[PDB]
Design a binder for this molecule. Structure first.
Ligand code: HEM
Ligand SMILES: *[C@@H]1O[C@H](CO)[C@@H](O[C@@H]2O[C@H](CO)[C@@H](O)[C@H](O)[C@H]2NC(C)=O)[C@H](O)[C@H]1NC(C)=O
Ligand code: MAN
Ligand code: CYN
Ligand code: CA
Ligand code: CA
Length: 336
């Protein structure tokens, strides 16, 4: 019932500043509302901001981190020295400037930019957006971000401490549907993790289950595993999680339904967004976030591979009936 100066109708006056932030991010940060490297960097950032949260450290008399507190920006000098935070400073600086110019908290801005960026990627669900997180933060403790060479046990333990069940770890990894690497293997910059790095779809879950046959680069980078076709990169953590008895049935259940995947991801991102916070103390400004263009494409097994090339890892459920395609194997272009 609130009408912002802009003539947008919104639920609360605390949302009105976010319409200006929307316009700025879509023109500038997102280079005309695109789904390219900025959104992908922002998703690494939202994860690495929020996951600096450790009830186990708190329980052991230590600061455990403030979660989705914008610490990765406010204390970037410290946090961008962590192993998992390479290749982010240029994006962090862009966000810093936007937060200061519009006078919004860094923790809220990261969450907003996440929801806005997702909205530019076909097939995305509409992420919740809450405002009101204090701009105050202390540096995250070190060693809280899962790495691609970690065992499934280590990943589930860390994620579990933060608050996520194994199913939720799988659900959050839907973000690897919009993904590449730059820092693991320098010879294949922006090699995608799935065949559709600009579509928020189930391809990631399907393609990580295919037999690893292909070395996309002239050598291996850090935590790199064989992939199913030229141009695609596979990190060891994703390979293991796809196959591990603790995560494989949820991973398999993602393969055939973009709609269930999106719901699960939205729910898990909502939980992650308020690590360190009481969501009931925040204001819901989700109406600022528009819907994404719909994705009309069907799940597929690419390249004339079939279910026989799938390493079915959920021992109690048959692999879903997924369409196949013509060969030859594709060669993925670098993600834009
Ligand atoms: C569960 C453990 C996870 C591990 C070990 C992991 C590991 C990584 C690594 C090593 C990269 C490559 C970065 C580079 O070299 O450029 C990557 C990329 C990416 N990750 Fe994750 N990740 C995980 C979870 C997540 C989550 C929860 C999200 C966000 C919801 C996320 C979003 C992304 C995105 C979007 C990219 C692509 C970045 C790009 O294209 O520039 N990841 N991940
Ligand atoms: C959020 O807190 C940060 C850190 O104190 C503030 O960032 C500083 O902002 C000043 C004034 O604009 C800049 O001159 C500094 O470069 C910023 N420092 C860092 C580390 O980013 C920020 O202004 C605060 N935001 C709000 C809305 O109060
Ligand atoms: C096949 O072709 C793509 C480019 O079209 C590459 O990105 C890949 O590395 C392979 O050469
Ligand atoms: C991904 N970090
Ligand atoms: Ca943080
Ligand atoms: Ca995809």
């Amino acid at each position: 019932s609130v009408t912002c100066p802009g003539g947008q109708s919104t639920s609360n006056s605390q949302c009105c500043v976010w319409f200006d932030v929307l316009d700025d991010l879509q023109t500038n940060f997102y280079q005309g509302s695109k789904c390219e490297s900025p959104v992908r960097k922002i998703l690494r950032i939202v994860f690495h901001d929020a996951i600096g949260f450790s009830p186990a450290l708190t329980a052991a008399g230590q600061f455990g981190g403030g979660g989705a507190d914008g610490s990765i920006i406010a204390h970037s000098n410290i946090e961008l020295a962590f192993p998992a935070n390479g290749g982010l400073t240029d994006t962090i600086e862009a966000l810093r400037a936007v937060g200061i110019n519009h006078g919004v908290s860094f923790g809220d801005l990261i969450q907003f930019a996440t929801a806005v960026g997702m909205s530019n990627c076909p097939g995305s669900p509409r992420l919740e957006f809450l405002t009101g997180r204090s701009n105050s933060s202390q540096p995250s403790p070190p060693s809280l971000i899962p790495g691609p060479g970690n065992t499934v046990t280590a990943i589930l333990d860390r994620m579990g401490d933060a608050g996520f069940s194994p199913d939720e770890v799988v659900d959050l990894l839907a973000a690897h549907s919009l993904a590449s690497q730059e820092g693991l293997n320098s010879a294949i910059f922006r090699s995608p993790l799935d065949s559709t790095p600009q579509v928020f779809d189930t391809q990631f879950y399907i393609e990580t289950l295919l037999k690893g046959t292909t070395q996309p680069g002239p050598s291996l980078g850090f935590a790199e595993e064989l992939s199913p076709f030229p141009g695609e990169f596979r990190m060891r953590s994703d390979a293991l999680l796809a196959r591990d008895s603790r995560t494989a049935c949820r991973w398999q259940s993602m393969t055939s339904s973009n709609e269930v995947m999106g719901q699960r991801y939205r729910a898990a991102m909502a939980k992650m967004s308020v690590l360190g916070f009481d969501r009931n103390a925040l204001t819901d400004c989700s109406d600022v976030i528009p819907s994404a263009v719909s994705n009309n494409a069907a799940p597929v097994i690419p390249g004339g591979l079939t279910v026989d090339d799938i390493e079915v890892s959920c021992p109690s459920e048959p692999f879903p009936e997924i369409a196949t395609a013509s060969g030859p194997l594709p060669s993925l272009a670098p993600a834009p």
